[PDB]
Amino acid sequence: AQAEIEAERKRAREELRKQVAILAVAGAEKIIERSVDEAANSDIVDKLVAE
Amino acid sequence: DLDLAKASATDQLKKAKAEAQVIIEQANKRRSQILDEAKAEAEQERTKIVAQ
Numbered sequence: 001a002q003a004e005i006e007a008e009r010k011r012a013r014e015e016l017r018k019q020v021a022i023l024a025v026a027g028a029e030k031i032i033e034r035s036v037d038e039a040a041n042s043d044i045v046d047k048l049v050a051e
Numbered sequence: 052d053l054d055l056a057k058a059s060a061t062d063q064l065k066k067a068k069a070e071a072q073v074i075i076e077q078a079n080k081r082r083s084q085i086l087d088e089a090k091a092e093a094e095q096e097r098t099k100i101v102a103q
Contacts, residue, residue, distance in 0.1 A: 001097040 001100050005101060
């Protein structure tokens with residue numbers, strides 16, 4: 001019985017973590033979309049063209 | 052009376068053995084009862100613990 005309760009605790013913890021993962025990464029997406037500058041895009045491209 | 056003693060010895064043996072068999076089947080039954088009681092107690096214990 002305690003093993004089955006532990007399995008359900010695992011389930012609930014993972015579900016909560018996955019919801020916060022989705023929303024956190026979506027917020028990161030919107031941040032990166034709004035907060036950007038050419039002096040940063042050129043830096044990213046200059047890191048890419050290095051290899 | 053010698054052959055009657057023969058029959059008496061054999062009848063006594065078989066009577067004692069059939070008398071032991073009822074003791075044994077009794078133990079088997081008690082066992083079947085007490086293990087059912089234990090299983091039911093365990094089941095109700097699980098129900099309450101999981102509901103908690």
